[PDB]
């Protein structure tokens, strides 16, 4: 293999000293989701990736070698064959055009993207097309369905006939009330609400029943559905003497599983072209475009009565949103409601939304080779995005506050551009010495803006332009936001190699930026690394060992994902009189704003046995972060409340390993397996002005010196069998003593960390005669999560109108005194009994494919092959969590969008 790490031509993979991990094109393609990073959960060792939502428009979160900062971001640098991108822009690119994906994660691989590569770098390379006599056409098509992972938290909930009894015994309906007196008249009087409205005045009791007690309703079918997914592509790959092209046109439509709409749809195209003009010049261009229409489910992560998974858990089962035909109606009924509550397709019909994004990427390079070794490369690139969204609210619907309608239009524009000029020279001094020298220049620039205009007061559905609203008081100020930055850089790298066995590389880079404060704007980074081939020199041959390499490196990088404007003292409006405005300083800045400098030491070795049958690689890293960013609280001589400076230090120590192997049974059978693992423990070295502990306000965590940032809550000791109250532990006062009163002095540091330490995954595959079967598993163990829905589904007092758990029927009382749940007259707090073990093991995809044999296409000169495949994503998940998904969240599991399991089936004609 040949890897292009950074800049210049590729070296080798058994020569690089920096522990890169190359992912081939088999693991990226054929995937049925929009994000490409989610297909890498468990492949690259030491990189954990978690998608915290099951939207089509969701984006995975990637973290390589831990979380390196408490205060800034942790996402890597994603660059796509040159100029860098965001994940929302790689989501508008067809994943069948990616040839490889190399993950650079240790210094002397990452340290020439200095001030941007403190969190690693993912380097996605696109296809280039093979030079042959006649080109090749490839036509892919897929179709699948998507649905919710597991319906386990519905096995615990009450029914209707149990919830009525628990509510009337708890005293919610009345002091002396009873069932058949509460059931019959006080809340089956929903004909007093259904009688005012003309659309359902004559239909109550004939074709829709809002309150039904004889059998419960299915709220999962009322709030979640089974959603299709389609995908197709045509790609032409060709070449000739010198000239080589790869074109592609594709389409991808994916619909969300919840009833509240969320779709992602794109039409894309790509033309990679590369041709050499004469003996000393070669030009090329990567061009891409997309027209993408997103929509996302917004009411997830918030608590609203009757939406999300909170509405599946808590909405009482004796309310009925369906009609008598099993279809969803326009409205349902809650008690004490002034207006009937709209269901999800009616609310999706009354609140339209439409986004359209036009994306263009233009990338061009010209390469000149005058002398035998010199190579001068100049590369330019532009990245243009114009988005235009519109959302209205329709007039004259009866189940609303006002009959008038609103409209809002927004226009977005993000323009990025990048220039890179390198000069490489490689030469051999003797018969056994070798050198390579690279030096270059880079310039990055981004500017983007948002414009928005809103109007309200419409009375017709046809007369809904934005200049037809109501004047006077029904009109407001526009929206307008502008951001921009720029980077300049000069880098250099020397690769000195001995004959076969010793390679040493040394790199340096200078970065200046618009984000760094005006006193230190120039940043210097370096790295040194070395690899020694012990097999080619020391032990020349053996019977069981076939390869053995050792490598070590040290480097410094930085993280300039600080804000665009965080180093300067912003003045705002502070008026004195009524006629003239005044300006007064409001943030104080600081001119000495650094780039959050970190340094990494890495040591590893890679072995290979039984003539490259078995392969192993072990890596030990110490990654020390310095000068992190915190908005500190300031002394009073500042005259401000914060300064937002560079204080603190952290370190992550870890070990990761990776094994690959091949097993056989015959000359046609072929079995293989892989397994990788990463352990990472972190600690906080220092902090602010001589502090030891510091808790960030209303977050739930604490930064203690000497420990990872853990959870900061109360302990829970259960109930007592005397009076049946909740008992929390006391920090200290060992005898341990419990108090029944809750105060904010009962909080301590829990011994459970926030980011999960142990991350891994293992794959196993087989192949018989062109019919293969592969299975990939991914596990994260050591991850705790606050389950927030259990605040509402099992509280004794307060929020009594909602559906509860079944374990409130065994409540503590005088005749029932041996249980584990408290009395009914209490309110639970946020404490240790809401932390749950969110460790999981998933089966990421099971894929069974079949390539039709070459003897079937013998006379036909048109079609040259075919492939059929079946695929199941998220087929099994084993865990101990109780909230529909252990992966969907982090530090808090709210009303969440679960990850979805999917079944797809596809063909591919290589005709």
């Amino acid at each position: 293999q040949v890897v292009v790490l950074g800049y210049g031509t590729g070296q080798k993979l058994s020569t690089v000293s920096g522990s890169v991990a190359k992912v081939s094109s088999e693991k990226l393609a054929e995937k049925p989701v929009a994000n490409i990073m989610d297909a890498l959960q468990g492949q690259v060792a030491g990189m954990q990736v978690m998608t915290t939502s099951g939207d089509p428009t969701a984006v995975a979160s990637v973290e390589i070698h831990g979380t390196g900062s408490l205060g800034a971001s942790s996402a890597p640098l994603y660059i796509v064959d040159g100029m860098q991108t965001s994940l929302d822009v790689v989501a508008t690119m067809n994943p069948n055009d990616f040839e490889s994906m190399s993950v650079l994660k240790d210094a002397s691989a990452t340290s020439i993207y200095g001030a941007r590569a403190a969190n690693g770098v993912v380097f996605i390379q696109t296809k280039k097309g093979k030079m042959s006599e006649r080109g090749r056409i490839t036509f892919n098509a897929s179709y699948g369905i998507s649905q919710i992972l597991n319906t386990k938290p519905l096995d615990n909930m009450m029914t209707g006939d149990e919830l009525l009894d628990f509510q009337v015994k708890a005293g919610f309906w009345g002091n002396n009330q009873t069932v058949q007196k509460v059931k019959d008249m006080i809340l089956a009087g929903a004909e007093d609400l259904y009688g005012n409205y003309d659309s359902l005045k004559d239909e109550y009791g004939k074709t829709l029943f809002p309150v039904d007690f004889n059998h419960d309703a299915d709220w999962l079918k009322a709030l979640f559905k089974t959603a299709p997914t389609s995908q197709g592509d045509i790609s032409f790959s060709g070449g000739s003497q010198g000239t080589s092209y790869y074109a592609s046109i594709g389409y991808f439509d994916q619909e969300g599983m919840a009833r509240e709409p969320a779709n992602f749809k794109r039409y894309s195209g790509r033309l990679n072209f590369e041709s050499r003009i004469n003996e000393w010049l070669k030009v090329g261009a990567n061009l891409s475009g997309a027209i993408a229409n997103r929509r996302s489910a917004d009411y997830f992560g918030k608590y609203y009565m009757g939406s999300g998974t909170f509405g599946v858990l808590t909405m009482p089962r004796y309310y009925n949103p369906f009609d008598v035909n099993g279809d969803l109606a326009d409205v349902y009924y809650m008690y004490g409601a002034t207006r009937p509550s709209m269901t999800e397709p009616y609310f999706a019909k009354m609140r339209p939304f439409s986004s359209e994004s036009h994306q263009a990427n233009v990338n061009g390079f010209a390469q000149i080779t005058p002398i035998k070794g010199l190579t001068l490369k100049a590369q330019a690139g532009v990245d243009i995005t114009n988005t235009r969204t519109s959302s209205k609210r329709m007039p004259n619907n009866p189940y609303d506050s006002t009959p008038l309608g609103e409209r809002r239009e927004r226009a977005y524009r993000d323009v990025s551009k990048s220039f890179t000029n390198t000069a490489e020279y490689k030469f051999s001094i003797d018969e056994k010495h070798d050198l390579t020298a690279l030096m270059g220049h880079e310039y990055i620039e981004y500017e983007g803006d948002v414009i928005g205009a809103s109007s309200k007061g419409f009375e017709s559905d046809k007369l809904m332009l934005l200049s037809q609203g109501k004047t006077g008081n029904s009109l407001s100020l526009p929206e307008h936001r502008v951001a921009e930055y720029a980077y300049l850089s000069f880098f250099s790298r020397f690769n000195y190699g001995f004959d076969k066995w010793m390679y040493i590389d040394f790199s340096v880079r200078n970065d200046q930026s618009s984000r760094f404060g005006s006193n230190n704007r120039s940043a210097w980074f370096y790295s040194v690394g070395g690899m020694f081939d012990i097999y080619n020199k020391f032990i020349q041959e053996s019977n069981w060992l076939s390869d053995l390499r050792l490598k070590m490196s040290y480097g410094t990088t930085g993280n300039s994902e600080i804000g665009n404007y965080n180093h300067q003292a912003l003045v705002t409006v502070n008026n004195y009189t009524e006629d003239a405005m005044g300006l007064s300083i409001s943030t104080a800045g600081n001119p000495d704003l650094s780039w959050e400098k970190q340094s990494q030491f890495n040591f590893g070795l890679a072995a290979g046995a039984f003539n490259n049958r078995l392969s192993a690689e072990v890596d030990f890293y110490v990654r020390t972060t310095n000068d992190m960013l915190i908005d500190v609280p300031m002394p009073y001589i500042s005259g401000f409340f914060s300064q937002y400076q560079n204080v603190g230090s952290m370190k992550n120590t870890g070990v990761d390993l990776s094994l690959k192997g091949t097993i056989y049974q015959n000359k046609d059978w072929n079995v293989y397996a892989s397994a990788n693992f990463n352990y990472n423990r972190q600690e906080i070295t220092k902090l602010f002005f001589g502090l030891n502990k510091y808790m960030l306000p209303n977050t739930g965590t604490i930064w203690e010196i000497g420990y990872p940032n853990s959870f900061y809550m109360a302990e829970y000791a259960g109930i007592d069998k005397k009076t049946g109250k909740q008992l929390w532990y006391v920090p200290g006062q060992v005898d341990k003593v419990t108090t029944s009163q809750y105060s904010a002095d009962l909080e301590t540091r829990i011994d459970k960390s926030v980011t999960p330490p142990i991350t891994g995954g293992f794959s196993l595959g087989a192949s018989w005669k062109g019919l293969s079967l592969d299975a990939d598993f991914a596990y994260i163990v050591g991850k705790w999560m606050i389950n927030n829905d259990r605040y509402f589904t099992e509280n004794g007092g307060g929020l009594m109108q909602l559906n509860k758990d079944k374990m409130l029927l065994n409540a503590w009382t005088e005749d029932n005194k041996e249980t584990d749940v408290p009395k009914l007259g209490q309110s639970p707090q946020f404490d240790t009994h809401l932390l749950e073990n969110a460790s999981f093991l998933r089966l990421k995809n099971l894929k069974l494919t079949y390539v039709l044999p070459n003897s079937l296409f013998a006379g036909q000169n048109v079609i040259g092959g075919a492939r059929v495949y079946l695929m199941a994503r998220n087929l099994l998940t084993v865990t101990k969590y109780k909230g529909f998904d252990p992966e969907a969240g982090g530090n808090v599991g709210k009303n969440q969008y679960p990850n979805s399991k999917q079944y797809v089936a596809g063909i591919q004609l290589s005709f």
Partner: peptide
């Protein structure tokens, strides 16, 4: 859907 924000939730 909407109607009542039914919240005593923790910060994300």
């Amino acid at each position: 859907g909407t109607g009542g924000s039914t919240g005593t939730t923790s910060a994300g």
